[PDB]
Design a protein around this ligand. Structure first.
Ligand SMILES: O=C(O)CCCC[C@@H]1SC[C@@H]2NC(=O)N[C@@H]21
Ligand SMILES: O=C(O)CCCC[C@@H]1SC[C@@H]2NC(=O)N[C@@H]21
Ligand SMILES: O=C(O)CCCC[C@@H]1SC[C@@H]2NC(=O)N[C@@H]21
Ligand SMILES: O=C(O)CCCC[C@@H]1SC[C@@H]2NC(=O)N[C@@H]21
Lengths: 120, 131, 123, 122
């Protein structure tokens, strides 16, 4: 449903190394849509690993808007692994929590799509 | 200094709480441009606070493309604080869109040029003083 | 072998909640022993989760000594999950392995201490 | 004030490089004492940088005990910078961070850190 989806934008290395390395990428979701606002934003940073068991392996930082007095506890950290179900990255991915990451990788390095979190 | 400029894109909370809280935001740079490619990407996550000396306080994650055997050491973590220079150091009387929008510098001397849009987008250019 | 063993010390919550929650803990290794010195230290922060397949799930920060010009790239971050080889005190006490093949030997004491030895498969 | 202090233990590089690099260290506090229990633990990882304005610069991870369903939101991250009141002798003493929290530490000759922590926030 519309209510559960949030806009994402990011960037990826559109000319990765050819030495066996992964493809670096990152993206952001701000947790506001027309339905809800959690006053927070998550960024995922990680890499795409191609081949027989393709994955996007990430670490993330989730910052909430806080008063100055609460800033010390503004940021959560964690790690999400995505499995699928430029060409490599583009498609629909799910993580270990059941969240859905729908993304288009542009030839130029853009990532654009939607994120639906299974948790809140 | 074209060789040292990179595209950025991100998101922010375009309707922040009115309980005195900051405004959550984040953005990404992939470290490839038409001249150079570090095979890496940084994301910054943090919050904007307006006022007399506008500030964006962030933590960041810098992931390099690695082999699977080196993946354990793929990700650096750190923290940058940005202060505003253009159009001024102050948020200047406008909301989070206007307060965020402009040119900023961090403690390393890197330059963050950003335009914040009414429906949550951040679009700009980043230049790093280190790397 | 000896060359790859390092002293570890840490703390845990010796009176965790009895509401389905895990048990908070953390520990430190400085990567100096009598055979080598990497001029760095890792801390692991996480929780012990009990049951038929007990787990210690952690995130870590590995800081190297750097010059001030390189301090921006001093700290790696990552995550290790430990499973046990062969109360929270008894739960944590023993020998553990992570997804890298590293070995974690620890005694958790009634007063909240963690004392042991770490061997890294990649460090 | 016993009621506001928590036991810490950690390790540090007791033979750092002599090339101007800082001294790596880390420590842990479990947030349980005889008076209070937050069911959480913080680890600080960082480096001591000596000189006339010595500092211990850290990043930290604060993990709370959670149910499995809440584990995704178990761990806070941040950064504290410590200044010393008035590298073994370097580290040993009393330090305060930007929040006014107090870090009291003895550095042992072979790499141990032992002391107390008091947080000005909670
Ligand atoms: O609670 C909030 O402030 C907004 C929702 C955050 C959901 C987080 S983002 C990191 C993690 N991975 C997911 O798929 N969901 C959670
Ligand atoms: O070395 C790389 O892989 C690319 C350059 C990274 C520069 C980093 S991003 C985090 C920190 N903040 C800056 O302004 N620059 C450094
Ligand atoms: O390279 C170094 O500076 C020291 C060795 C570090 C090994 C790290 S600690 C985090 C991760 N978990 C392990 O078991 N090994 C690596
Ligand atoms: O809230 C808790 O779970 C226990 C107190 C945590 C206080 C934290 S530790 C990191 C940061 N630095 C401080 O000096 N205090 C806060």
């Amino acid at each position: 449903n519309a209510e559960s989806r949030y806009v994402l934008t990011g960037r990826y290395d559109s000319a990765p190394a050819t030495d066996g390395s992964g493809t670096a990428l990152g993206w952001t979701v701000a947790w506001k849509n027309n339905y809800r606002n959690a006053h927070s934003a998550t960024t995922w940073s990680g890499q795409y690993v191609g081949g027989a068991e393709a994955r996007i392996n990430t670490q993330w930082l989730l910052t909430s808007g806080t008063t100055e007095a609460n800033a010390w506890k503004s940021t959560l950290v964690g790690h999400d692994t995505f499995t699928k179900v430029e060409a490599g990255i583009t498609g629909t991915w799910y993580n270990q929590l059941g969240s859905t990451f729908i993304v288009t990788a542009g030839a130029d390095g853009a990532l654009t799509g939607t994120y639906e979190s299974a948790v809140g």
